[PDB]
Amino acid sequence: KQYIISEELISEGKWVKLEKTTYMDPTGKTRTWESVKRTTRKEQTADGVAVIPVLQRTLHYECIVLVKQFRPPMGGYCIEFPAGLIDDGETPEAAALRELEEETGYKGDIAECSPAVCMDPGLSNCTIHIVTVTINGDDAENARPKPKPGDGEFVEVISLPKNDLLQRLDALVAEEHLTVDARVYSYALALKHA
Amino acid sequence: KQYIISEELISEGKWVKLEKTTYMDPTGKTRTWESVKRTTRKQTADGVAVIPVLQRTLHYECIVLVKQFRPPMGGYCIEFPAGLIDDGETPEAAALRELEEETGYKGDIAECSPAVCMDPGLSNCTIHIVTVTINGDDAENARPKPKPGDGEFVEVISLPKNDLLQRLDALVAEEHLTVDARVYSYALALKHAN
Ligand SMILES: Cn1cc(C(N)=O)c([C@@H]2CCCNC2)n1
Ligand SMILES: [Cl-]
Ligand SMILES: [Mg+2]
Ligand SMILES: [Mg+2]
């Protein structure tokens, strides 16, 4: 029933733009929407990837590997799945493994890869693939993981047991000013609800 | 170590603005970031998203989701019931109201997250994730009456909690819908638990 009629630029930055979207509603009335988009998406199936990295080690409980970074939009530190934008020509899987190694030092193995999912669909067109990766923490390549950050990347690694994820995130929120990412919190809630 | 130095307004709409954020990197070099904010926050957070657990005896437990056309996406999305928090509203209250308006269900609060970030590399947007159970055997929920605001056009899709990720994938495959990142994350963790 509903479809896009027109998209008009309001403001284009180097990385992010604001558009006036005109669309058809299901009464048959025309309406507008203020919409955010990145300037960086080309042929990618999505803007980015986020990695759910399952650290596995004999006689350890499974951990979820997260990252803590300053996020200028938020004006503070956030705890998130490792994530980055997909380079032009790069597959989602390659992007996930690369970003995981850059941000955490770990060399993972692909488990599964989602379809493109929407980040905040009332605000933006931004999409990611959520890629689940296992990390064999018994491999000597994953013994001494060193983050390889790029220019302007400054990432701390935080590994938390899957079997207590939500409480451990709450204990970090209670101990410093920081925000947990919604996808991470969602994942931690479902682990409790199951 | 890192902190905001200043913001430069690029472009303000009615609903959304684009800023250029100047910040101190951890090495003492001054850096810039293009950031999006909503104009509507007072509030604990921008919005709520409701995880509604529909509980009917002798039936599978279901998660209640909404399908809506999203003008920034140019298509239909599958999401948790959700909306912005009114000035004066507590998140719990917003959650119960948004749930009722969007699905017709009347729910009881189970738990409420702290403010969590939606897309922290892009925006400052935050929500409370509010877990709510719906006693589906209760007379008030026998004929759930979804009460839209002006311009809202919401289908209700209840999916069994035990097969959630497979059922979401089936919808994407069959229907050209985008599933929400927090919905997908939650569905993933349901399968990953234990
Ligand atoms: C919103 N945003 C995304 C990017 C990016 N392309 O990684 C940026 C810039 C990149 C150049 C240095 N400062 C940050 N801003
Ligand atoms: Cl529950
Ligand atoms: Mg990143
Ligand atoms: Mg990166």
Ligand SMILES: [Mg+2]
């Ligand atoms: Mg809504």
Ligand SMILES: [Mg+2]
């Ligand atoms: Mg609503």
